Design a protein around this motif. Structure first.
Motif, PDB file in Angstrom:
ATOM      1  N   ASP A   2      77.385-102.012  54.429  1.00  0.00           N
ATOM      2  CA  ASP A   2      78.463-101.105  54.062  1.00  0.00           C
ATOM      3  C   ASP A   2      79.802-101.564  54.634  1.00  0.00           C
ATOM      4  O   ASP A   2      80.052-101.459  55.833  1.00  0.00           O
ATOM      5  CB  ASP A   2      78.116 -99.695  54.550  1.00  0.00           C
ATOM      6  N   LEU A   3      80.657-102.082  53.759  1.00  0.00           N
ATOM      7  CA  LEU A   3      81.974-102.570  54.153  1.00  0.00           C
ATOM      8  C   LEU A   3      82.882-101.418  54.557  1.00  0.00           C
ATOM      9  O   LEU A   3      83.920-101.616  55.192  1.00  0.00           O
ATOM     10  CB  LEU A   3      82.609-103.340  52.997  1.00  0.00           C
ATOM     11  N   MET A   4      82.482-100.211  54.178  1.00  0.00           N
ATOM     12  CA  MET A   4      83.250 -99.016  54.490  1.00  0.00           C
ATOM     13  C   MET A   4      82.965 -98.573  55.930  1.00  0.00           C
ATOM     14  O   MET A   4      83.809 -97.942  56.567  1.00  0.00           O
ATOM     15  CB  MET A   4      82.870 -97.909  53.505  1.00  0.00           C
ATOM     16  N   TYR A   6      80.593 -96.345  57.214  1.00  0.00           N
ATOM     17  CA  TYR A   6      80.518 -94.904  57.374  1.00  0.00           C
ATOM     18  C   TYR A   6      79.786 -94.489  58.643  1.00  0.00           C
ATOM     19  O   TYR A   6      80.222 -93.577  59.340  1.00  0.00           O
ATOM     20  CB  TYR A   6      79.863 -94.263  56.148  1.00  0.00           C
ATOM     21  N   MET A   9      82.359 -94.672  61.226  1.00  0.00           N
ATOM     22  CA  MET A   9      83.437 -93.699  61.108  1.00  0.00           C
ATOM     23  C   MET A   9      82.891 -92.311  61.442  1.00  0.00           C
ATOM     24  O   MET A   9      83.580 -91.490  62.042  1.00  0.00           O
ATOM     25  CB  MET A   9      84.020 -93.703  59.694  1.00  0.00           C
TER      26      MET A   9
ATOM     27  N   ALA B  22      89.577 -90.671  57.815  1.00  0.00           N
ATOM     28  CA  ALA B  22      89.471 -92.074  58.175  1.00  0.00           C
ATOM     29  C   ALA B  22      89.279 -92.952  56.924  1.00  0.00           C
ATOM     30  O   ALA B  22      89.771 -94.081  56.865  1.00  0.00           O
ATOM     31  CB  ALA B  22      88.318 -92.272  59.165  1.00  0.00           C
ATOM     32  N   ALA B  23      88.568 -92.436  55.927  1.00  0.00           N
ATOM     33  CA  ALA B  23      88.344 -93.193  54.697  1.00  0.00           C
ATOM     34  C   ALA B  23      89.661 -93.358  53.925  1.00  0.00           C
ATOM     35  O   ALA B  23      89.973 -94.450  53.451  1.00  0.00           O
ATOM     36  CB  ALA B  23      87.301 -92.495  53.829  1.00  0.00           C
ATOM     37  N   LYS B  26      91.902 -96.060  55.157  1.00  0.00           N
ATOM     38  CA  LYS B  26      91.512 -97.405  54.763  1.00  0.00           C
ATOM     39  C   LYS B  26      91.973 -97.620  53.324  1.00  0.00           C
ATOM     40  O   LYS B  26      92.422 -98.707  52.960  1.00  0.00           O
ATOM     41  CB  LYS B  26      89.998 -97.591  54.855  1.00  0.00           C
ATOM     42  N   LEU B  33      90.282 -99.835  48.924  1.00  0.00           N
ATOM     43  CA  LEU B  33      88.882 -99.801  49.297  1.00  0.00           C
ATOM     44  C   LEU B  33      88.181-101.047  48.788  1.00  0.00           C
ATOM     45  O   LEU B  33      88.550-101.593  47.755  1.00  0.00           O
ATOM     46  CB  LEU B  33      88.212 -98.578  48.671  1.00  0.00           C
ATOM     47  N   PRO B  34      87.153-101.512  49.506  1.00  0.00           N
ATOM     48  CA  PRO B  34      86.420-102.703  49.074  1.00  0.00           C
ATOM     49  C   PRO B  34      85.579-102.339  47.850  1.00  0.00           C
ATOM     50  O   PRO B  34      84.844-101.353  47.879  1.00  0.00           O
ATOM     51  CB  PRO B  34      85.532-103.024  50.275  1.00  0.00           C
ATOM     52  N   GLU B  35      85.693-103.116  46.778  1.00  0.00           N
ATOM     53  CA  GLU B  35      84.902-102.851  45.581  1.00  0.00           C
ATOM     54  C   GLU B  35      83.460-102.815  46.063  1.00  0.00           C
ATOM     55  O   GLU B  35      83.089-103.587  46.945  1.00  0.00           O
ATOM     56  CB  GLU B  35      85.061-103.990  44.582  1.00  0.00           C
ATOM     57  N   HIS B  37      83.537 -99.354  46.166  1.00  0.00           N
ATOM     58  CA  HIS B  37      83.671 -98.041  46.784  1.00  0.00           C
ATOM     59  C   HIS B  37      84.681 -97.133  46.096  1.00  0.00           C
ATOM     60  O   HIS B  37      85.865 -97.437  46.060  1.00  0.00           O
ATOM     61  CB  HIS B  37      84.061 -98.195  48.261  1.00  0.00           C
ATOM     62  N   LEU B  39      85.821 -92.915  45.777  1.00  0.00           N
ATOM     63  CA  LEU B  39      85.604 -91.656  46.459  1.00  0.00           C
ATOM     64  C   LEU B  39      85.803 -90.369  45.681  1.00  0.00           C
ATOM     65  O   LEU B  39      86.797 -90.184  44.975  1.00  0.00           O
ATOM     66  CB  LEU B  39      86.490 -91.602  47.709  1.00  0.00           C
ATOM     67  N   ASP B 107      80.670 -90.788  48.174  1.00  0.00           N
ATOM     68  CA  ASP B 107      80.897 -92.180  47.793  1.00  0.00           C
ATOM     69  C   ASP B 107      79.563 -92.721  47.279  1.00  0.00           C
ATOM     70  O   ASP B 107      78.680 -93.064  48.061  1.00  0.00           O
ATOM     71  CB  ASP B 107      81.345 -93.001  49.001  1.00  0.00           C
ATOM     72  N   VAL B 110      77.375 -96.310  48.372  1.00  0.00           N
ATOM     73  CA  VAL B 110      76.404 -96.404  49.461  1.00  0.00           C
ATOM     74  C   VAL B 110      75.648 -95.094  49.647  1.00  0.00           C
ATOM     75  O   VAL B 110      74.991 -94.883  50.665  1.00  0.00           O
ATOM     76  CB  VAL B 110      77.080 -96.777  50.799  1.00  0.00           C
ATOM     77  N   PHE B 112      76.680 -92.069  50.316  1.00  0.00           N
ATOM     78  CA  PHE B 112      77.102 -91.349  51.503  1.00  0.00           C
ATOM     79  C   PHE B 112      77.740 -90.044  51.065  1.00  0.00           C
ATOM     80  O   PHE B 112      78.787 -90.044  50.430  1.00  0.00           O
ATOM     81  CB  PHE B 112      78.093 -92.190  52.300  1.00  0.00           C
TER      82      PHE B 112
END
Lengths: 116, 118
Positions: A2-4, A6, A9, B22-23, B26, B33-35, B37, B39, B107, B110, B112
Motif C-alpha cells: 500500500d503506497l498510501m 494506511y 496513517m 492525512a490522506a 497527500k 495520489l498514487p494510481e 488510489h 477516495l 478507498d 486497498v 480500506f
C-alpha cells in the motif's frame, strides 16, 4: 503493498485517543474507576521537557502512569503537562503526543503502539 | 468487563477522522495520489460548517458522497476542515467540509474503509 500507507496513517492518527482520554481525565470527575493509563514516550524527542535530573535517568523511553497520584493535568492539542511523583518527589512533565510510543489501559486491556 | 467506561472504540473511531485529513494532504501535493488510489468521502450535508452550491447540496440534505480521483483541484486540507473544487455535471464548484461532518471514508484500491458516528 500500500503506497498510501494506511496502517501507518491510522497508527499516527490514533495518537488522538490518548489526547481524548487525558481530556476526560482533566474534566470534572477524572477517569472513571477503575480506569488508569500507562503512557510511554521518547525522553529525547523534540518538545518533551521536565527536570534534567529525572530525564537523564531515562536515556530513551519512559513510561508514566495516571491513576490517582497525579496533579494538574493540562491536555492541550499538541502536548500535555502533568505532575507526578518520583521517589516521592513531585515533578512536572510536558510531552507532545508526537513523542508517544505506547498507550495502555489495563481495565479493558486497550492498547496502542506508535511509531514515534 | 461488562463495560468500557472510557468508550475507547468511540474515541478511536473519532480519532481516525485524522486518517482522512492525512490522506487529503497527500492528495493535495503535486502528483496527487498514487494510481490507482481514489477516495470516497461521505459527510452529513447539514452539519455545521458544510458549505457549497445550495442547489447541489439541496439535492441530498442527508449524506452525500464525493470521490477524489483525478478531476479535483485546489484541495486545502486545513486544520479542522478541507475545501476542494470538484466538477458536478462538468461545472467546477467549491466544497467545504469539516472533518467532524465525515460519516464515511473509503478507498477501493486497498479495501480500506472507515465509518464515523453521525
Amino acid at each position: 503493498e500500500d503506497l498510501m500507507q494506511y496502517e501507518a496513517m491510522a497508527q499516527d492518527a490514533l495518537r488522538g485517543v490518548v489526547k481524548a482520554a487525558l481530556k476526560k481525565a482533566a474534566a470534572p470527575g477524572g477517569l472513571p474507576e477503575p480506569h488508569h493509563l500507562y503512557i510511554t514516550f521518547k525522553t529525547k524527542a523534540a518538545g518533551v521537557s521536565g527536570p534534567q535530573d529525572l530525564l537523564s535517568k531515562y536515556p530513551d523511553e519512559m513510561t508514566i502512569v495516571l491513576q490517582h497520584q497525579y496533579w494538574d493535568l493540562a491536555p492541550g492539542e499538541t502536548f500535555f503537562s502533568v505532575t507526578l511523583k518520583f521517589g516521592g518527589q513531585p515533578k512536572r512533565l510536558s510531552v507532545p503526543y508526537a513523542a508517544l510510543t505506547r498507550f495502555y489501559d489495563p481495565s479493558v486491556q486497550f492498547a496502542l503502539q506508535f511509531s514515534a
